[PDB]
Amino acid sequence: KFHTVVPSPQVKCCGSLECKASSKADYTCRVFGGVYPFMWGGAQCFCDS
């Protein structure tokens, strides 16, 4: 029995970024724009979507 890895996501604020693969087995990666970041501390960073 295995366990999935859920590492801390990368957030680039009001800019751009690109996906990169990893040597880890059964690895998966994907970007997403127009994020809606919120947390108990609030909007992690600021720019109009």
Partner 1 sequence: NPGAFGDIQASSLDATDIVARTDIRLLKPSVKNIHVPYTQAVSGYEMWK
Partner 2 sequence: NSVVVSVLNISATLGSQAVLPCKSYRMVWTQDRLNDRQRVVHWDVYSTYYGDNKMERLCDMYSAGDQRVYSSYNQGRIFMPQNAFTDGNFSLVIKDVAESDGGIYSCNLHHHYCHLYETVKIQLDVTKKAKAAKEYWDGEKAVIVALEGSTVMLPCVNRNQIWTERHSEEEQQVVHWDRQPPGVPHDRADRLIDLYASGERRSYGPLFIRQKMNITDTAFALGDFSLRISELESADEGTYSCHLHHHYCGLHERRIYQVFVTEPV
Ligand X SMILES: CC(=O)N[C@@H]1[C@@H](O)[C@H](O)[C@@H](CO)O[C@H]1O
Chain residues in the site for ligand X (CB under 6 A): 34, 49
Short-list 18, 19, 12, CA closest to 34? 12
Query: One symbol per residue from 18 to 37: x for binding partner 1 (CB under 8 A), - otherwise; what is it?
Result: ------xxx-xxx-x--xxx
Measured CA distances, 12 to 3, 4, 23, 41, 47 (Å): 27, 24, 23, 18, 11
**Residue found under tokens 């970024």:** 17
Which does residue 48 touch among partner 2, partner 1, ligand X, none (CB within 5 to 8 A, set by kind)? Answer: partner 2
CB of 24 to partner 1, least distance (A): 8
Q: Is 41 in the site for partner 2 (CB under 8 A)?
A: no
